[PDB]
Write an enzyme that holds these catalytic residues in place. Structure first.
Site, PDB file in Angstrom:
ATOM      1  N   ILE A  97       0.818  -1.203   0.000  1.00 58.78           N
ATOM      2  CA  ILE A  97       0.000   0.000   0.000  1.00 58.78           C
ATOM      3  C   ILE A  97       0.859   1.263   0.000  1.00 58.78           C
ATOM      4  O   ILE A  97       0.505   2.270  -0.615  1.00 58.78           O
ATOM      5  CB  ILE A  97      -0.943  -0.053   1.219  1.00 58.78           C
ATOM      6  CG1 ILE A  97      -1.818  -1.314   1.171  1.00 58.78           C
ATOM      7  CG2 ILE A  97      -1.783   1.221   1.340  1.00 58.78           C
ATOM      8  CD1 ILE A  97      -3.100  -1.157   0.365  1.00 58.78           C
TER       9      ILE A  97
ATOM     10  N   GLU B 143      -3.343  -5.713   8.504  1.00 58.25           N
ATOM     11  CA  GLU B 143      -2.610  -4.482   8.235  1.00 58.25           C
ATOM     12  C   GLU B 143      -1.279  -4.524   8.990  1.00 58.25           C
ATOM     13  O   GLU B 143      -1.249  -4.686  10.218  1.00 58.25           O
ATOM     14  CB  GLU B 143      -3.462  -3.277   8.632  1.00 58.25           C
ATOM     15  CG  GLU B 143      -4.831  -3.270   7.937  1.00 58.25           C
ATOM     16  CD  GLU B 143      -5.889  -2.385   8.614  1.00 58.25           C
ATOM     17  OE1 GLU B 143      -5.561  -1.587   9.519  1.00 58.25           O
ATOM     18  OE2 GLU B 143      -7.075  -2.496   8.231  1.00 58.25           O
TER      19      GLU B 143
ATOM     20  N   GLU C  43      25.279   5.993  17.219  1.00 59.87           N
ATOM     21  CA  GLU C  43      24.133   6.812  17.591  1.00 59.87           C
ATOM     22  C   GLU C  43      24.374   7.538  18.907  1.00 59.87           C
ATOM     23  O   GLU C  43      24.051   8.719  19.025  1.00 59.87           O
ATOM     24  CB  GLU C  43      22.879   5.951  17.636  1.00 59.87           C
ATOM     25  CG  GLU C  43      22.000   6.170  16.419  1.00 59.87           C
ATOM     26  CD  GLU C  43      21.306   7.528  16.457  1.00 59.87           C
ATOM     27  OE1 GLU C  43      21.025   8.009  17.588  1.00 59.87           O
ATOM     28  OE2 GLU C  43      21.031   8.097  15.367  1.00 59.87           O
TER      29      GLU C  43
ATOM     30  N   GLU D 229      24.376  11.555  18.435  1.00 65.48           N
ATOM     31  CA  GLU D 229      23.229  12.234  19.016  1.00 65.48           C
ATOM     32  C   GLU D 229      23.599  13.016  20.272  1.00 65.48           C
ATOM     33  O   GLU D 229      22.975  14.048  20.561  1.00 65.48           O
ATOM     34  CB  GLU D 229      22.113  11.217  19.314  1.00 65.48           C
ATOM     35  CG  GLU D 229      20.713  11.726  18.941  1.00 65.48           C
ATOM     36  CD  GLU D 229      19.569  10.750  19.277  1.00 65.48           C
ATOM     37  OE1 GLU D 229      18.386  11.183  19.212  1.00 65.48           O
ATOM     38  OE2 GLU D 229      19.839   9.565  19.595  1.00 65.48           O
TER      39      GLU D 229
ATOM     40  N   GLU E 296      21.152  20.044   9.430  1.00 70.13           N
ATOM     41  CA  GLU E 296      20.356  21.244   9.675  1.00 70.13           C
ATOM     42  C   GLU E 296      18.876  20.931   9.858  1.00 70.13           C
ATOM     43  O   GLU E 296      18.152  21.750  10.431  1.00 70.13           O
ATOM     44  CB  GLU E 296      20.539  22.263   8.534  1.00 70.13           C
ATOM     45  CG  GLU E 296      20.668  21.693   7.115  1.00 70.13           C
ATOM     46  CD  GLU E 296      19.386  21.100   6.546  1.00 70.13           C
ATOM     47  OE1 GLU E 296      19.426  19.952   6.038  1.00 70.13           O
ATOM     48  OE2 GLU E 296      18.337  21.785   6.588  1.00 70.13           O
TER      49      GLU E 296
END
Lengths: 180, 177
Positions: free
Chosen positions: A12, A36, A90, A94, A134
């Site tokens: 989908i 789903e 990470e 971060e 940015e």
């Protein structure tokens, strides 16, 4: 082992963050049912406690919630990379920290009713500050356990990986007060 | 909070199914640039931590198609418009496990997957239980639960939050008894 075998699949949506597919599955019935399924790469998240007993966190806007929340550092799993390397990168990208140990704690689905997202939590020990986008807006935060607990009460901390993280620190401290 | 708020400049609905709706928002970043946001809309749930008089945590085995796996979880159900989730918690407990309870108090609420979904879980603690196919019903001591985490039979975040709540009970009862 129980299964709802997929007999049809409809793709989908295939976006930058999530894919959505609808699986048509057999039932013990012999009838069919739609499933789903949001597919998601998976995430590494880091419980990083400074030498000062302060847990490192970030605040950012989570558009599905229309609010900013305070979370442990996390990023997506990369194809054909060691998730422990991913946690190290990470942490540093971060929060500008390096660490000595990065040890896998636990993995879990976040909402397995409709999504296959898995979070892998790593604990980082031995933190020190590395010196030197940015479109990325994160806010670096360091909290005492008691402040984190107060952030839960205020619902500034409001997602499953970070609640789990905070509870883990609570436990580590309580068992640190089971030896004093 | 509203830190780094990203205003919707345009919404497009992709999908509207039984469980999930999907939309794509165009948003204005804090620096004025535009970006796109994929957003799954989901009802939100109530989940129950239930500790029996045998001090076992009550869980149910659930088939989770997105995982291709059956996993062991605390009972949970969809929110009901207009109904106090505490009342929803009591019903879900009873029909999933057969337990009634004397106390059902809210513990914590959280977003399961805030990167892309708005699903909120509301967790309630049921105390003082008593029994009124239940084949998926599973009762676990703390130590079996910790072993279920080791085998990844317990493998979603609400259930891990519950085992950790049981763990914190034990490491705090051990300070008073």
């Amino acid at each position: 082992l129980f299964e709802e075998k997929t007999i049809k699949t409809e793709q989908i949506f295939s976006g930058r963050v999530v894919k959505l597919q609808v699986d048509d599955v057999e039932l013990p019935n012999g009838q069919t049912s739609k499933r789903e399924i949001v597919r998601h790469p998976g995430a590494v998240a880091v419980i990083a406690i400074t030498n000062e007993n302060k847990i490192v966190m970030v605040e950012q806007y989570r558009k599905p919630l229309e609010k900013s929340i305070v979370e442990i550092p996390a990023g997506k799993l990369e194809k054909g990379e060691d998730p422990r390397i991913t946690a190290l990168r990470e942490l540093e990208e971060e929060t500008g920290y390096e660490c000595e140990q990065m040890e896998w704690l636990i993995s879990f689905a976040t909402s397995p009713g409709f999504a296959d997202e898995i979070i892998h939590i790593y604990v980082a020990k031995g933190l020190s500050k590395k010196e030197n986008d940015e479109d990325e807006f994160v806010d670096l935060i360091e909290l005492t356990l008691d402040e984190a607990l107060q952030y839960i009460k205020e619902q500034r901390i409001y997602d499953s990986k970070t609640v789990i993280a905070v509870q883990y620190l609570q436990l580590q401290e309580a068992l640190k007060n089971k030896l004093e």
